[PDB]
Design an enzyme around this catalytic site. Structure first.
Site, PDB file in Angstrom:
ATOM      1  N   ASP A  46      -5.703  -3.352   9.574  1.00 24.09           N
ATOM      2  CA  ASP A  46      -5.829  -3.765   8.303  1.00 24.09           C
ATOM      3  C   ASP A  46      -7.024  -3.453   7.479  1.00 24.09           C
ATOM      4  OD1 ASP A  46      -3.418  -4.997   8.671  1.00 24.09           O
ATOM      5  OD2 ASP A  46      -4.444  -7.015   8.797  1.00 24.09           O
ATOM      6  N   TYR A 330       7.364  -5.340   7.179  1.00 23.59           N
ATOM      7  CA  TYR A 330       7.027  -5.265   5.654  1.00 23.59           C
ATOM      8  C   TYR A 330       8.126  -4.933   4.925  1.00 23.59           C
ATOM      9  CZ  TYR A 330       2.485  -8.075   5.710  1.00 23.59           C
ATOM     10  OH  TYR A 330       1.719  -9.031   5.960  1.00 23.59           O
ATOM     11  N   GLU A 351       8.692  -1.175   6.813  1.00 25.45           N
ATOM     12  CA  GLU A 351       7.949  -0.721   7.772  1.00 25.45           C
ATOM     13  C   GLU A 351       8.773  -0.535   8.964  1.00 25.45           C
ATOM     14  OE1 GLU A 351       4.885  -3.523   7.783  1.00 25.45           O
ATOM     15  OE2 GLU A 351       3.582  -2.180   6.688  1.00 25.45           O
TER      16      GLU A 351
END
Ligand SMILES: CC(=O)N[C@H]1[C@H]([C@H](O)[C@H](O)CO)OC(C(=O)O)=C[C@@H]1O
Length: 373
Positions: A46, A330, A351
């Protein structure tokens, strides 16, 4: 045993010189084109997010297939010295203005750091375009005008990720789903809660809606027309092994009837992002809800499509249908009008495979829930 047979399945982003996560899909009805956005990161982590990329896909009616043009960086979508995250697209059908909302965080400052120190440094931004993404305006920092006084009350926050919502209220209001970590107790650690940013003047000014009285994270909203009013259903990520659903009768300002929906599983320890949209009912209710999210009790796998024919009744959620086997995380849904078989057409970005690609799926309601026909 196999996953659902669909109209199209193509990988539109792949790890290469960069990794790609956090998909956002936006349909442009007048062009019969889709805009796929994603975080172009230096790695899967992230904190390694950098810029946002985009691809325009044009639906070809003769072949009922989408052909995507080459990806390109949305150069303007960034603040000097900050990494861009959480792409949240929205098209204002009245002004012909395309919006791309996102957050900007200094260098690699993690979410963990802001949380452990109760110190917020995240910025809310946007960029706009009047030629469907051909050129973009300079970025604009909305932090001051949209969060202001509440900034010090949150350890950190985020928008989406995923498509936003433009309501069918007279003002054609813009609604951006979000969540923030609330500093509530002197000793107890801050608890996150979902909420929405609201604009009633086509993006000139913004406001903050109230919180969902529950420990909630990333969310999306969809507008549903009941037999009496328009309601905004909010579907949020939770750490209680099930999704949290709440409803708003005032266009995003207040959410009530907050509760766990045991039929919509959430994996440990804190769940996973999911997507929800409304679409024209094939038949009392005018719209039904479609939701995509992993269906595993222990991990992020087996992306499923769930249907709610009686929205937003929690117990009305159907059992899921398998859209993709294995590692799935996601996702983002978009209604694309009427498909080749006469049933609602859907576009879905998700994803897949340990975050090494983002797949574009196009299917219809007839394909997903045939028992309805
Ligand atoms: C801004 C940010 O870092 N968002 C991250 C989000 C966040 O950690 C969680 O919603 C709790 O706050 O989680 C995940 C995740 O795959 O679980 C990826 C996102 O990039």
């Amino acid at each position: 045993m196999a996953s659902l047979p669909v109209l199209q399945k193509e990988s539109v982003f792949q790890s290469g010189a960069h990794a790609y996560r956090i998909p956002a899909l936006l349909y442009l009805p007048g062009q019969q084109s889709l805009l796929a956005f994603a975080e172009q990161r230096a790695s899967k982590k992230d904190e390694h997010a950098e810029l946002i990329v985009l691809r325009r896909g044009d639906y070809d009616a003769p072949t009922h297939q989408v052909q995507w043009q080459a990806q390109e960086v949305v150069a303007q979508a960034r603040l000097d010295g900050h990494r861009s995250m959480n792409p949240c697209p929205l098209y204002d059908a009245q002004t012909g203005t395309l919006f791309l909302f996102f957050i900007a965080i200094p260098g690699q400052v993690t979410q963990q750091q802001q949380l452990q120190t109760r110190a917020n440094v995240t910025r809310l931004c946007q960029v706009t375009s009047t030629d469907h993404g051909r050129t973009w305006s300079s970025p604009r920092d909305l932090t001051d005008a949209a969060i202001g006084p509440a900034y010090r009350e949150w350890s950190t926050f985020a928008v989406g990720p995923g498509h936003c919502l433009q309501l069918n209220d007279r003002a054609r209001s813009l609604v951006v789903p979000a969540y923030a970590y609330r500093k509530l107790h002197p000793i107890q650690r801050p608890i996150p809660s979902a909420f929405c940013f609201l604009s009633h003047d086509h993006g000139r000014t913004w406001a903050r809606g109230h919180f969902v009285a529950q420990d909630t994270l990333e969310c999306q909203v969809a507008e549903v027309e009941t037999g009496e009013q328009r309601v905004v259903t909010l579907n949020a990520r939770s750490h209680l092994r099930a999704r949290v659903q709440a409803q708003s009768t005032n266009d995003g300002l207040d959410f009530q009837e907050s509760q766990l929906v045991k039929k919509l599983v959430e994996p440990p320890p804190q769940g996973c992002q999911g997507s929800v949209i409304s679409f024209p009912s094939p038949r009392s209710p005018a719209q039904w809800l479609l939701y995509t999210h992993p269906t595993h009790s222990w991990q992020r796998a087996d992306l499923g499509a769930y249907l709610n024919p009686r929205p937003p009744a929690p117990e009305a959620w159907s059992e899921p249908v398998l859209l993709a086997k294995g590692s799935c995380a996601y996702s983002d849904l978009q209604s694309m009008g009427t498909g080749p078989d006469g049933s609602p057409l859907f576009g879905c970005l998700y994803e897949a495979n340990d975050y090494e690609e983002i797949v574009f799926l196009m299917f219809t309601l007839k394909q997903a829930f045939p028992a309805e026909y």
